[PDB]
């Protein structure tokens, strides 16, 4: 699929047996998901964005199927206003920008 | 250009006679540039992000040359940590996501 940017680049993702909508975000280095029950242990981490910082739970080697394409990587869970798929996962499914 | 996402997709911009680097950000609805001296009027605005909100100056009908491509739209100026080109202008340069 080729995606235009006239609307929010939202895809349906499946993570931890749950279905969600996430924003394909080329400006995000890592993936940050709203509060959700992720399996396993975690590590506290702090990440910064517009308006300040948030505390997140870092889960490593998490499976995540973005638009039918499978990827495993680090997922951060915390008080983000939107689920964002970052470059750590976009690279694994071959997503590219074109203009 | 087709851009891979193994590194941040940072591109050159020309705005107000000034040269800057900006991030092609599909997760941003609007364009937000780091603090810079822009000519003309503006209106007070507040914008939200991962960590919260910041107050910015909204400028309309501002010309920007993103990696040699010309576009006119709304530019927000404020305490953002990075210059980010949002979808309001990405559509103007024909930017698409591809996977
Ligand atoms: C410093 C570089 C930029 C700002 C990083 N960010 C990516 C951006 O794309 C971000 C995505 C976004 C979309 C939302 F709908 C809600 C939201 F809270 C965040 N957009 C954003 O703030 O845009 C502004 C302007 O347009 C408006 O629309 C959306 C909100 C407004 S991040 O998310 O802060 C971030 C990502 C990863 C990491 C670590 C884990 O690697 C840390 C921080």
Residue nearest to atom 39 of ligand 1 (CA): A30
Give the separation between CA B79 and CA B67, rounded to whole angstroms. 23
Q: Let me know if A25 is a catalytic residue.
A: yes
Specify the experimental method.
X-ray
- Record the resolution, in angstroms: 1.9
Q: Which three-class secondary structure state does DSSP give residue B87?
A: helix
Enter the tokens of residue B11.
Answer: 């591109």
For position B68, which CATH number holds? 2.40.70.10
Q: How many domains does chain B have?
A: 1
For residue B26, the 8-state DSSP code is T
Give the separation between CA A72 and CA A61, rounded to whole angstroms. 5
Which numbered atom of ligand 1 lies nearest the CA of A32? 40
Measured from the Cβ of residue B55, the count of other Cβ atoms closer than 10 Å reads 11
Answer whether A6's CB lies under 8 Å from B91's CB: yes
> How close B9 comes to chain A (CA, Å)?
7
Enter the tokens of residue A38.
Answer: 């992720």
For residue A90, the 8-state DSSP code is H
Q: What residue in B sits closest to A68 (Cα-Cα)?
A: B99
* Ligand 1 mean position, distance from CA B27 (Å): 6
Kindly write down the DSSP assignment for every residue of B10-32, as one continuous string. Answer: EEEEEETTEEEEEEE-TT-SSEE
Give the separation between CA A81 and CA A73, rounded to whole angstroms. 21
Instruction: Indicate the pairing of strand B43-48 with strand B53-66.
Output: antiparallel
Give the separation between CA B97 and CA B99, rounded to whole angstroms. 7
Answer whether A87's CB lies under 8 Å from A28's CB: yes
Burial degree of A88 (CB within 10 A; 0-12, 13-18, 19+):
middle
Domain with B59, as residue range(s), is 1-99
For residue A70, report the phi and psi dihedrals to the nearest 5 degrees: -90, 145
* Ligand 1 mean position, distance from CA B85 (Å): 12
| Beta pairing partners, A46 | A55
Answer whether B92's CB lies under 8 Å from B71's CB: yes
Counted across chains A and B, CB pairs separated by less than 8 A come out at 140
């Amino acid at each position: 699929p080729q995606i235009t940017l006239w609307k929010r680049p939202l895809v349906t993702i499946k993570i931890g047996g749950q279905l969600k909508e996430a924003l394909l975000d080329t400006g995000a280095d890592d993936t940050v998901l709203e509060e959700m029950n992720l399996p396993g242990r975690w590590k506290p981490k702090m990440i910064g964005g517009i308006g300040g910082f948030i505390k997140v739970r870092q889960y490593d080697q998490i499976l995540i199927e973005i638009c039918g394409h499978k990827a495993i990587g680090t997922v951060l869970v915390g008080p983000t206003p939107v689920n964002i798929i970052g470059r750590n996962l976009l690279t694994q499914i071959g997503c590219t920008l074109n203009f």
